[PDB]
Symmetry: D2
Subunit: 334 residues, 4 copies
């Protein structure tokens, strides 16, 4: 029974909390978020504009978060080293604030008594990235701090692994059309720290170009593809669910139907739960609260010729990802 701590009770923190509620092998025992009192915290957990209300009565008494019989400890500590994780026997800390993305910074959780840490984002430094279904078995129990990569990487890696393993990816460029994120502004304004100016432009009415190392990070989890992938993003006014568009060149030539079939037997076989497959005329809203990392859209993508393909895959960037964080938490503890 993995004891999880959550630092940053935001989109991912709260949805990680929610996904653990249906998991026996993992339970959340402690939360930290200094920008939110207990009464406020309970409101944000109870109500969700995207994923609906919490499937359970959410109360607080005596400074605890009550989910029926379960009392969850709540802290409000800006300094992550002052969070008494070890007091609640926390096995793993889900680091979902977005501002401690370095081994030096994340390791402050260790000084508070947490055994291990997962960054809910790619690292700013050289912290081991792990993607469930792709390279998680290579994790070593003495690695105390790891990254679970981005939502976009969790989407592109399974697709790329399948395409590469069978046909061999020569080179690829990715576009992701990404749902709205908390680093964006409701109206034109200054981006946090004066970096990524476009992100501070009005979210409601703009297609917004964005940099992303998610495609390039696939080379970290799948070394074979080091130097063979990169990409960009475009932000759009969408609540959740994003889509990857991979234009790739392959070694062994194929028909699009053969590419689709290979992806289908991975989805039905060794990548069940991580990689999905569909042939339906789906749109983004059809993947809200889907827990897969990548759902391949057969009819959306296409082939220019025997070696040049456009491959389309969907992902609920909040929910798919939040599940993987649990999957990783359990794995690195067990």
């Amino acid at each position: 029974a993995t004891k999880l701590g959550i630092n940053g009770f935001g989109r991912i923190g709260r949805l990680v909390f929610r996904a653990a509620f249906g998991r026996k092998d993992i339970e959340v025992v402690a939360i930290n978020d200094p920008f939110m009192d207990l009464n406020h915290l309970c409101y944000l957990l109870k109500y969700d504009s995207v994923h609906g209300q919490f499937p359970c009565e959410v109360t607080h008494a005596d400074g605890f978060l009550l989910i029926g019989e379960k009392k969850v400890s709540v802290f409000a500590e800006k300094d992550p080293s002052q969070i008494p994780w070890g007091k609640c026997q926390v096995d793993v800390v889900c680091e979902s604030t977005g501002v401690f993305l370095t081994k030096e910074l994340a390791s402050s959780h260790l000084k508070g008594g947490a055994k291990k840490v997962i960054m809910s984002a790619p690292p700013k430094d050289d912290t081991p990235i792990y993607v469930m279904g792709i390279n998680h078995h290579q994790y070593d129990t003495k690695q105390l701090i790891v990254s679970n990569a981005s939502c976009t990487t969790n989407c592109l890696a399974p697709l790329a692994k399948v395409i590469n393993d069978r046909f061999g990816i020569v080179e690829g460029l990715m576009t992701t059309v990404h749902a709205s994120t908390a680093n964006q502004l409701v109206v034109d304004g200054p981006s946090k720290g004066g970096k990524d100016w476009r992100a501070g432009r009005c979210a409601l009415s703009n297609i917004i170009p964005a940099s992303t190392g998610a495609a390039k990070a696939v080379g970290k989890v799948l070394p074979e593809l080091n130097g063979k992938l990169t990409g960009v993003a475009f932000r759009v006014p969408i609540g959740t669910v994003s889509v990857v568009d991979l234009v790739c060149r392959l070694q062994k030539p194929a028909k699009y139907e053969e590419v689709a079939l290979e992806i289908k037997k991975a989805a039905e076989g060794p990548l069940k739960g991580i990689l999905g497959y569909t042939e339906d005329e789906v749109v983004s809203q059809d993947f809200v609260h889907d827990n897969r990392s990548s759902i391949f859209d057969m009819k959306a993508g296409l082939a220019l010729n025997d070696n040049f393909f456009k491959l389309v895959s969907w992902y609920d960037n909040e929910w798919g990802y939040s599940n993987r964080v649990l999957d990783l938490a359990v794995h690195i503890t067990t």
Copy 2:
């Protein structure tokens, strides 16, 4: 002539700048905003998601904001006391930060050398409030710090005035359906300071109830209506333009056509430039970049009977209000 300073180069500050650019009787000489480098500030001014690109060249050299052939000074102080308005010879400071809405806080501009201050919002204390066309002539030149009220008050007040003058308002309740503002969040999160929980809810997908004092404020600029008006607001995913629905009970009976005509003659007579009138089948976007405070929508409202009415008026909550801040700045100086 009038030399304007702007504290907070946000939605209002940048549009106060833009409007002042089109005027001869007033010029902006200084700007303060510590969350904005000079490069960033130029970019935010150059491009606008709502009101299009600034209609002039926007460059910078020597730490000065250049607008064609005019230097504007730029400061980056968090403490209004530390901004050297006096050297720039500022007559009025436009206090458009949202965080210095009392006489104690706003007076540090006067310490910095500025002659007078206009709060671009309702005050949190008993600072004098003025709405152009309603009570601005009652301005006393001894008053160095004033409020230009809210945008919603500037829309409602001219409507209530004309209606009250001719028919007498017994009592009124108001709803404003309001466009998106910078206090809102793109995704569900905790609102600043843990106040106004609903406003932290996803802006893109929700109708969000909001408290507003704008209808109570009409009682301050029109004392006769003190205690007779209040209301609420609903935030909606709209870039700009909001709408007031005033349900009022009148002492003197009238037909809807008589009420409409009275507003038409005010709009074309004494309140021209402040209050507008239309009988066209208009929608919110039709009032983007409309500089009027209030635009009565004749066909949108109706009457239940000879003393019970719903009166509908539009306002560009950004642009209309921004022009008023200039009108008031000129008035309190001249």
Copy 3:
């Protein structure tokens, strides 16, 4: 047991089908829609942008629609007289096309062999209107064609009944902020048959004023309130969930706490499942797939004085109403 047929398999058509799947006491045996082949119809039922995927597998075979051990006849006829409801043994026809809203038009369904008809919209003629919880017990089998009113009326009528019963309503005016509907247009264009020009304006970026008879229709189902209520609507870019904002004057004086408690009594007793009550800081998304006609929002509204109040109520215009249609269909058959 109750055999329902549906005409117009749109937002209301499909969600009635959906609610009915959760119900044993009512079953959908037939469907008609001429703009929608059986393959296309299955796609539109399996996937919903607002309410999520259909709660079970959806296929078709031999011209029927399979939902487990169930088979639903599907027709594609523009003329309602040519749909064989009779051969399906249909008790009630859900008339949700939008275009057969008079007895003379709707009686075409009776010529097809159906026993009774519920118009899923307010009628354009003197057709009897019923609102569940308000006047439905006044129905008698005699009348073969009825109306379930509008979503808005199903929201307002319970609120108004309770307030009128306890305090007495003198006069009332209502604004509804309404979610988007299928009569609206994506880009500016001509409204259907030149009616309601405003509805033809871009739905994504506009607050759109609109007429409604929904408040005036309360006086049919509640004769007492005839001549005492009317109102208007503002359409906005929201998928589903709408809010009613009722300004009313009461005969007996009252504090807002007394008003709230009365609504809370009704919602917990006689109007359980029709009228709801909340004290939370809710936004529109919190009511998606909420099956109640009316959810009173205590903290959203307020009183100006002892006799003048603003009362705020939410409704899922799609789902709440779709369940009311089923309640009515059962009642007129039982």
Copy 4:
């Protein structure tokens, strides 16, 4: 001086009309649209949710559209053979209904007396396609019926020309993130003809994959690139402005800065007015009402290697394309 006729007074029809209002070299003398009364037609011309109010008074009298003082003839015909283009001395008809896209259909205008015709969309047959700046000089006056291609082709073709001219495109795949169009639905519903189910899915809340021939169409205007380019689209809830994202292999190797410099040089010289260049951190709203066909975004793209590039270009799909129709009209008349 060139006299223009408009069949179909919709987004493209009305924006072509507006685009002509300013210009001296072309003039609209007659309009035809049967699904629109004159008064309604004046309403739709006067008000625009994207491009603001018509910059001139619009009225009608005696069945003439009056702009300022100028009388424009208005018709309501389903057979263009009956529209008196000849009487109005029309040099070119802008065919912008979307349903006369063959020689057989389009040639009814010629019997009506229109000297030439431009389809405001890709043809359903082998009608000669033209794109200004690209292959327009290969037009000869014997061709009376032509096509201005799509907005997407007009964005891509300029970018494809420059890159192919200097570096040689081996293969290319394109994504366009595209603004909402008239064929979309506000809420989930059946797309017309039963064609393209995804396009009937809710436009406000979805990323919607779409087919596009616009990348394959670049082979017709540039025979050298035939069979080398294809692509897909994603529709998103945006009022106007779209972006092309072209991934391609080049024959001759290059750095991104060299490629970017080559585009800049074409934008400043031979492709000025048609192709644009920027290194600013733009968002879609910055190109609303931009009359260029393609604006290259330098910072939004990147290179994987010396031969494999992602090139990004913006376009106001409404305004740029509309001005290109007029350009083509003037060209085919002179």
